[PDB]
Amino acid sequence: QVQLQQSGAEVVKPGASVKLACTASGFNIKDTYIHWVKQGPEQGLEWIGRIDPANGNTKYDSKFQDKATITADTSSNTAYLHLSSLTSEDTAVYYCVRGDYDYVYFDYWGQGTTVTVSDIQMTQSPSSLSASLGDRVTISCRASQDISNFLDWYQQKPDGTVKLLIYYTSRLHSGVPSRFSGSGSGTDYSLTISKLEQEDIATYFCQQGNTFPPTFGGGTKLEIK
């Protein structure tokens, strides 16, 4: 089955560089697009860039064009993120992710590599909430411009696991229970969990996949009390 096994954490000094790795298994990275996503305390989830491993063609968010270099090796089925002249600002978790339709959606995520150094705006509401077992909760997001239903939802568990929940506003990813549903159009979208279970404790993120570069909302942390 699909795996994205990411390299171990890096602890480095300011001004150093690092090269993170992710070894895929159960599929060939030549058959998809491999992306890298930064999760830092300061800016949340930010798409860094991607590579088409079949031809090595890369694209980047301009914010990272001097910081990040993405490469891939089809033989070893491994993708890489090189980060140059590191600073405190680069301290983050770096996710390697796949998406066979580029950034329309990110259907599988690695576990994230910690690095410790010693444009459509998406907004989500609420930023956090506490609910009870069996409750119904609705989380919303607003895009700064019309994204024509190209809106995805991700669930990040406390252990760092990130999964695709819903894509294209309302389509459930494989294995996602019926309790999750999505709605909206234009700029305004929502995710509803109809009967909350204890396993739903997570941070929920939206993403638009319509407009280069893909951008994420700030997250909604759901707790159960």
Side-chain angles (χ1 to χ4, degrees), residues 121-136:
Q121 303 291 322
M122 303 300 295
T123 61
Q124 299 182 219
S125 187
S127 54
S128 60
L129 73 167
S130 303
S132 291
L133 284 190
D135 273 5
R136 146 184 212 101

PDB file of all heavy atoms in Angstrom, residues 121-136:
ATOM      1  N   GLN A 121      -6.230  34.005  -0.081  1.00  0.00           N
ATOM      2  CA  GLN A 121      -6.147  33.867   1.364  1.00  0.00           C
ATOM      3  C   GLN A 121      -7.327  33.037   1.851  1.00  0.00           C
ATOM      4  O   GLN A 121      -8.482  33.338   1.531  1.00  0.00           O
ATOM      5  CB  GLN A 121      -6.118  35.236   2.050  1.00  0.00           C
ATOM      6  CG  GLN A 121      -4.976  36.149   1.587  1.00  0.00           C
ATOM      7  CD  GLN A 121      -3.601  35.658   2.040  1.00  0.00           C
ATOM      8  OE1 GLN A 121      -3.444  35.150   3.152  1.00  0.00           O
ATOM      9  NE2 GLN A 121      -2.597  35.814   1.174  1.00  0.00           N
ATOM     10  N   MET A 122      -7.022  31.971   2.587  1.00  0.00           N
ATOM     11  CA  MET A 122      -8.018  31.092   3.179  1.00  0.00           C
ATOM     12  C   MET A 122      -8.094  31.384   4.670  1.00  0.00           C
ATOM     13  O   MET A 122      -7.067  31.399   5.357  1.00  0.00           O
ATOM     14  CB  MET A 122      -7.667  29.614   2.946  1.00  0.00           C
ATOM     15  CG  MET A 122      -7.512  29.230   1.482  1.00  0.00           C
ATOM     16  SD  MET A 122      -8.990  29.485   0.451  1.00  0.00           S
ATOM     17  CE  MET A 122     -10.139  28.321   1.185  1.00  0.00           C
ATOM     18  N   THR A 123      -9.302  31.616   5.165  1.00  0.00           N
ATOM     19  CA  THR A 123      -9.526  31.837   6.585  1.00  0.00           C
ATOM     20  C   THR A 123     -10.561  30.836   7.071  1.00  0.00           C
ATOM     21  O   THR A 123     -11.544  30.570   6.378  1.00  0.00           O
ATOM     22  CB  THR A 123      -9.997  33.272   6.866  1.00  0.00           C
ATOM     23  OG1 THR A 123     -11.236  33.508   6.192  1.00  0.00           O
ATOM     24  CG2 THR A 123      -8.972  34.274   6.367  1.00  0.00           C
ATOM     25  N   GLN A 124     -10.331  30.274   8.252  1.00  0.00           N
ATOM     26  CA  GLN A 124     -11.221  29.291   8.847  1.00  0.00           C
ATOM     27  C   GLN A 124     -11.833  29.837  10.123  1.00  0.00           C
ATOM     28  O   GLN A 124     -11.206  30.612  10.849  1.00  0.00           O
ATOM     29  CB  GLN A 124     -10.492  27.992   9.189  1.00  0.00           C
ATOM     30  CG  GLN A 124      -9.914  27.330   8.004  1.00  0.00           C
ATOM     31  CD  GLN A 124      -9.243  26.018   8.341  1.00  0.00           C
ATOM     32  OE1 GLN A 124      -8.207  25.717   7.785  1.00  0.00           O
ATOM     33  NE2 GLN A 124      -9.841  25.230   9.242  1.00  0.00           N
ATOM     34  N   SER A 125     -13.044  29.374  10.413  1.00  0.00           N
ATOM     35  CA  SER A 125     -13.742  29.746  11.616  1.00  0.00           C
ATOM     36  C   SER A 125     -14.578  28.554  12.049  1.00  0.00           C
ATOM     37  O   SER A 125     -15.137  27.862  11.186  1.00  0.00           O
ATOM     38  CB  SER A 125     -14.636  30.975  11.398  1.00  0.00           C
ATOM     39  OG  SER A 125     -15.182  31.406  12.638  1.00  0.00           O
ATOM     40  N   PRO A 126     -14.643  28.251  13.357  1.00  0.00           N
ATOM     41  CA  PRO A 126     -13.871  28.904  14.419  1.00  0.00           C
ATOM     42  C   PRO A 126     -12.410  28.476  14.361  1.00  0.00           C
ATOM     43  O   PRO A 126     -12.089  27.581  13.579  1.00  0.00           O
ATOM     44  CB  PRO A 126     -14.539  28.397  15.699  1.00  0.00           C
ATOM     45  CG  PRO A 126     -15.073  27.065  15.322  1.00  0.00           C
ATOM     46  CD  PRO A 126     -15.528  27.200  13.894  1.00  0.00           C
ATOM     47  N   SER A 127     -11.540  29.091  15.161  1.00  0.00           N
ATOM     48  CA  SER A 127     -10.164  28.602  15.211  1.00  0.00           C
ATOM     49  C   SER A 127     -10.026  27.417  16.157  1.00  0.00           C
ATOM     50  O   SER A 127      -9.105  26.609  16.005  1.00  0.00           O
ATOM     51  CB  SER A 127      -9.208  29.730  15.602  1.00  0.00           C
ATOM     52  OG  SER A 127      -9.589  30.354  16.810  1.00  0.00           O
ATOM     53  N   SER A 128     -10.918  27.293  17.132  1.00  0.00           N
ATOM     54  CA  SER A 128     -10.935  26.129  17.999  1.00  0.00           C
ATOM     55  C   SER A 128     -12.328  25.988  18.580  1.00  0.00           C
ATOM     56  O   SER A 128     -13.082  26.958  18.683  1.00  0.00           O
ATOM     57  CB  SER A 128      -9.906  26.230  19.124  1.00  0.00           C
ATOM     58  OG  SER A 128     -10.163  27.360  19.931  1.00  0.00           O
ATOM     59  N   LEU A 129     -12.659  24.762  18.961  1.00  0.00           N
ATOM     60  CA  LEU A 129     -13.945  24.499  19.579  1.00  0.00           C
ATOM     61  C   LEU A 129     -13.818  23.226  20.403  1.00  0.00           C
ATOM     62  O   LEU A 129     -12.931  22.399  20.170  1.00  0.00           O
ATOM     63  CB  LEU A 129     -15.062  24.386  18.532  1.00  0.00           C
ATOM     64  CG  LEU A 129     -15.144  23.144  17.637  1.00  0.00           C
ATOM     65  CD1 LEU A 129     -16.476  23.107  16.930  1.00  0.00           C
ATOM     66  CD2 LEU A 129     -14.020  23.095  16.603  1.00  0.00           C
ATOM     67  N   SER A 130     -14.685  23.109  21.400  1.00  0.00           N
ATOM     68  CA  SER A 130     -14.796  21.914  22.228  1.00  0.00           C
ATOM     69  C   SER A 130     -16.229  21.424  22.132  1.00  0.00           C
ATOM     70  O   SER A 130     -17.165  22.219  22.266  1.00  0.00           O
ATOM     71  CB  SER A 130     -14.439  22.204  23.693  1.00  0.00           C
ATOM     72  OG  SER A 130     -13.134  22.739  23.829  1.00  0.00           O
ATOM     73  N   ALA A 131     -16.405  20.123  21.897  1.00  0.00           N
ATOM     74  CA  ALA A 131     -17.725  19.542  21.707  1.00  0.00           C
ATOM     75  C   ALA A 131     -17.790  18.227  22.469  1.00  0.00           C
ATOM     76  O   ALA A 131     -16.808  17.792  23.076  1.00  0.00           O
ATOM     77  CB  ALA A 131     -18.051  19.347  20.222  1.00  0.00           C
ATOM     78  N   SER A 132     -18.964  17.604  22.450  1.00  0.00           N
ATOM     79  CA  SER A 132     -19.204  16.352  23.150  1.00  0.00           C
ATOM     80  C   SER A 132     -19.439  15.224  22.159  1.00  0.00           C
ATOM     81  O   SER A 132     -19.823  15.445  21.010  1.00  0.00           O
ATOM     82  CB  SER A 132     -20.415  16.471  24.088  1.00  0.00           C
ATOM     83  OG  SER A 132     -20.114  17.325  25.175  1.00  0.00           O
ATOM     84  N   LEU A 133     -19.227  13.994  22.635  1.00  0.00           N
ATOM     85  CA  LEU A 133     -19.549  12.803  21.858  1.00  0.00           C
ATOM     86  C   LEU A 133     -20.988  12.848  21.355  1.00  0.00           C
ATOM     87  O   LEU A 133     -21.914  13.156  22.109  1.00  0.00           O
ATOM     88  CB  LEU A 133     -19.356  11.549  22.713  1.00  0.00           C
ATOM     89  CG  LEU A 133     -17.921  11.085  22.968  1.00  0.00           C
ATOM     90  CD1 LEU A 133     -17.925   9.705  23.615  1.00  0.00           C
ATOM     91  CD2 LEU A 133     -17.144  11.063  21.672  1.00  0.00           C
ATOM     92  N   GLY A 134     -21.174  12.519  20.076  1.00  0.00           N
ATOM     93  CA  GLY A 134     -22.479  12.576  19.456  1.00  0.00           C
ATOM     94  C   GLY A 134     -22.943  13.952  19.020  1.00  0.00           C
ATOM     95  O   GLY A 134     -24.005  14.053  18.391  1.00  0.00           O
ATOM     96  N   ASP A 135     -22.198  15.013  19.331  1.00  0.00           N
ATOM     97  CA  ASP A 135     -22.541  16.366  18.903  1.00  0.00           C
ATOM     98  C   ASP A 135     -22.445  16.500  17.379  1.00  0.00           C
ATOM     99  O   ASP A 135     -21.928  15.630  16.671  1.00  0.00           O
ATOM    100  CB  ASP A 135     -21.607  17.401  19.541  1.00  0.00           C
ATOM    101  CG  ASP A 135     -22.072  17.880  20.913  1.00  0.00           C
ATOM    102  OD1 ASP A 135     -23.073  17.346  21.438  1.00  0.00           O
ATOM    103  OD2 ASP A 135     -21.419  18.803  21.463  1.00  0.00           O
ATOM    104  N   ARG A 136     -22.945  17.626  16.878  1.00  0.00           N
ATOM    105  CA  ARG A 136     -22.737  18.044  15.497  1.00  0.00           C
ATOM    106  C   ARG A 136     -21.976  19.363  15.510  1.00  0.00           C
ATOM    107  O   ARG A 136     -22.317  20.277  16.269  1.00  0.00           O
ATOM    108  CB  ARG A 136     -24.082  18.163  14.761  1.00  0.00           C
ATOM    109  CG  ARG A 136     -24.189  19.260  13.717  1.00  0.00           C
ATOM    110  CD  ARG A 136     -25.620  19.299  13.174  1.00  0.00           C
ATOM    111  NE  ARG A 136     -25.702  19.715  11.773  1.00  0.00           N
ATOM    112  CZ  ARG A 136     -25.860  18.875  10.753  1.00  0.00           C
ATOM    113  NH1 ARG A 136     -25.941  17.568  10.968  1.00  0.00           N
ATOM    114  NH2 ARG A 136     -25.932  19.348   9.516  1.00  0.00           N
TER     115      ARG A 136
END
